[PDB]
Design a protein around this ligand. Sequence first.
Ligand code: HEC
Ligand code: HEM
Ligand code: HEM
Ligand SMILES: COc1ccc2c(O)c(C)c(-c3cncc(-c4ccc(OC(F)(F)F)cc4)c3)nc2c1
Lengths: 237, 65, 98, 72, 370, 58, 32
Amino acid sequence: ELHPPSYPWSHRGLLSSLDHTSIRRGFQVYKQVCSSCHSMDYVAYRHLVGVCYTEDEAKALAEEVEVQDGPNEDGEMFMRPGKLSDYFPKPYPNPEAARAANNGALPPDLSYIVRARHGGEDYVFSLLTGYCEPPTGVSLREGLYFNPYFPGQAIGMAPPIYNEVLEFDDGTPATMSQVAKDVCTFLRWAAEPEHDHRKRMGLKMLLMMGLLLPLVYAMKRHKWSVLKSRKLAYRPP
Amino acid sequence: LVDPLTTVREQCEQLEKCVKARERLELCDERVSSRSQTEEDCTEELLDFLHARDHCVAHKLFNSL
Amino acid sequence: WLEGIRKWYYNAAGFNKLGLMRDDTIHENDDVKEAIRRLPENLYDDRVFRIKRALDLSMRQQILPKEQWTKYEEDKSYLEPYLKEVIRERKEREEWAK
Amino acid sequence: RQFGHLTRVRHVITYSLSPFEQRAFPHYFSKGIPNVLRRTRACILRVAPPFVAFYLVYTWGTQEFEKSKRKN
Amino acid sequence: LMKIVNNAFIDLPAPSNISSWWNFGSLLGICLILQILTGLFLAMHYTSDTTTAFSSVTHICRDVNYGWIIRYMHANGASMFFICLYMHVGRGLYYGSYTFLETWNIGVILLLTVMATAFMGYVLPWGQMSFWGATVITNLLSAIPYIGTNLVEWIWGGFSVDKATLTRFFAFHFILPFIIMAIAMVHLLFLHETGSNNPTGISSDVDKIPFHPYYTIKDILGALLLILALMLLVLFAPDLLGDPDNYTPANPLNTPPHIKPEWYFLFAYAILRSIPNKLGGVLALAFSILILALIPLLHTSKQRSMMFRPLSQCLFWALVADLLTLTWIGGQPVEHPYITIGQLASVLYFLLILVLMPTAGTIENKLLKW
Amino acid sequence: PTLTARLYSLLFRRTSTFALTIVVGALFFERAFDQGADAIYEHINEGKLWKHIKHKYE
Amino acid sequence: SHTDIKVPDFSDYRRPEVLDSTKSSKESSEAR
Ligand code: HEC
Ligand code: HEM
Ligand code: HEM
Ligand SMILES: COc1ccc2c(O)c(C)c(-c3cncc(-c4ccc(OC(F)(F)F)cc4)c3)nc2c1
């Protein structure tokens, strides 16, 4: 195996947050590349509100995709434009169709992929950005490709990204690296949306605990002070 | 379009550990290539190179992004 | 030589550094309390102070100067003469039942 | 049990002050520090060596574990 | 006239010298009461069914107002709840408090009652390492002759871990802490007949002190520091002691690479993986815990503490290293370097406890002319 | 006399008055601490939060 | 005897405001 390298992510800091601007770019990646082949069951279009999209922008995207909802009074089920409460649409109806559509292989969900793989986002960027031909003596079966950052170095994940594989809205150059950076930032928000609010409490704590610990430590050595300073003697007859 | 990653790797490949890991990778390649009917490969020799290169790419890459 | 080894172990233990003697430390036990009860007031009231001083040290996590530490040759076995008596009484009670 | 008749004590004296009349941090650095080092050297040779031994078997076992997985 | 019972919290005689090591008894009283409140508020949003459990945690960690903090004050509120024990026990062994047999034998019964509860509690999120953890570890009872094939299927409520295995853990889990709370008040009851021990092992009837201003504020301090090291993990490294494969839902047809329980069991697990014979491995596992009940019958030194027992100090801190080893080996895979180490350490654990440490105090008595 | 002595004579003497200080302190403390804490976090994470960029998308 | 009993020096631990035996402690009790 290969231990991935650790990077200077913007959010590695104990108080550092996520580049919400980058989360905006990262969603555009999942939506135009991976949402056709990966599920993300545990997120909603509403969760994007106030983080990378606003209310109206996300609402517009809710109305782009059709969702199966509503037992008709006739007794049937139909399709409607999605809403914010709706979750990210699953590309496939069931995993067998996925194994059917990817040579027996299973595209995993990506709600918790950051926190479900050792190394975290460092792994993922190195994974996408680690494709290469196999070395000599190595040969793989059809469908499967080589990547050093996987156990056995054999996966069905064909190249999802490359230079100008897509386009961004903010005029960013869509280098393969720029893409893989933003998406991993998005996924770290998916698997840990509390991240940006986690640390603020982490900040409030250390300032309070910076105060209460010495103060309590004074009242202790205030009350115990009687005993640290007492004395004794022995006056027999 | 230019991926800056290719530039950063290109510089890191010039580093001592990479050149030396490159060396054995070339040497094993000559071995397995010259030989036949063997199971040996250059898997390990490659990973040691890539563990070195990508470790150097770590310290520099996000400066461009 | 073993005597030198007994001596080093004594200083290594460190209950001299709290001014205690050996018999001050023995595990509180039925055969022991009997022996303690039989002590005289002078020797007993000294035992209590050697202890209560030591506890006052370990609370402060301090010790005494070397001048007050208990010396190996001065380690008085004030309790064993009375204790070995009690254990003899116990074995008679057991032997008498058998 | 309770205070009052726990045991018997005689000819013993205790002196003590009011905490409002004495510092809570007297000689905290001036005297406390060498007590720690004294408290340290008194015990450290008995705590260290098995954990020192651990760090070695941790690395040696780790490296030998690595080497086992590499090649002929 | 309850508050005559509060004299065990106010006017209680207690010694004067006792350092931080005794606070860990009280802190369990905080972790336990803390953990019950958190796990309760998790019950409000948890579902005990397999098709809904893993998502139910997501409902907490995503949609609920500060549901997520409660999960991590509670999971890691179990990890800290075992740092406290293992130090709360090591005190009892190093300072020789195990002479209070009535408490110690109950100290064991609290430990087991707990260390099965976490096992049940680790299942409830219903991921891989949850499922596969319970799949491996229940099968060990299958090693027993004439029973195990019947008992394991009974515990499972079936022929493999499935729905009814989960739902009953949730009920065996969300009850025992209320049984543990009883045994604690029992455990103290036999302690308040004898009063606690000190570093010296000497009767402290002379230098007792009250408990209301002195150890209270000391426990307020010690409790405060505990809330730090808990919330740091919650607020700076929550996945640290975890295991990320848990964040994949259970797939009984896809075995994870590394099966293992969490860190607080692993020294037990390493002992098991050491022995190839399956059943003989089990009786070593249960004996690694129950051996605590053999300590007082192996007391040999006429002293109690180990501040005044040099050789036992060196052996004691060696035992800690053997534990830390077994914690490490269990987390690591099974190969020829680690197999060999895991065997040696496990032998030391039983050897060191049963042979050397008794043998030491015998020798120490001889030097003191006893 | 010093300030500490003046504080005790008026506030920390009567336990009734004492408690009211603590509530009063908590309110102004709750306000002051949250403002200062957020300012630090934002200053560290300047230009990374939603509101710091929200103006662009209205 | 009992009259021979005398208190030792605590001045290593006493607060600086109360190290003068010749002054009345009341004046700074409010501050202490
Ligand atoms: C062409 C369809 C396809 C697209 C597009 C795609 N994936 Fe993959 N992916 C797969 C399949 C199929 C697998 C299964 C790999 C296996 O079974 O070994 C996989 C595996 C993975 C893995 C590794 C899982 C593991 O346990 O190692 C990750 C991570 C992942 N996908 C996420 C991504 C990422 C990141 C992208 C690009 C942003 C992406 N998917 C785009 C099909 C796809
Ligand atoms: C007293 C000893 C206890 C121990 C050792 C223990 C341990 C654990 C652990 C380690 C987990 C895993 C949680 C995770 O991985 O996210 C867990 C889950 C859980 N615990 Fe505790 N726990 C105890 C008591 C309780 C109590 C008292 C309650 C409720 C009052 C409770 C409620 C839960 C619930 C509902 C879960 C599953 C929900 C979830 O894990 O997200 N537990 N327990
Ligand atoms: C839920 C679990 C537990 C609770 C609530 C609990 C509670 C307490 C408390 C508050 C004390 C007094 C503080 C102290 O003496 O340290 C205590 C003492 C003690 N505990 Fe526990 N404890 C628990 C687990 C254990 C375990 C697992 C053991 C042994 C394996 C144990 C053995 C002891 C002993 C021997 C004492 C008395 C030692 C002495 O006073 O010198 N306890 N317990
Ligand atoms: C001398 O050693 C002893 C001897 C006997 C003890 C005993 O009989 C009990 C019941 C306890 C105890 C058990 N659980 C919880 C607490 C507790 C203490 C402070 C709190 O206050 C706050 F600051 F919030 F944590 C909250 C709970 C104390 N400690 C004993 C410690």
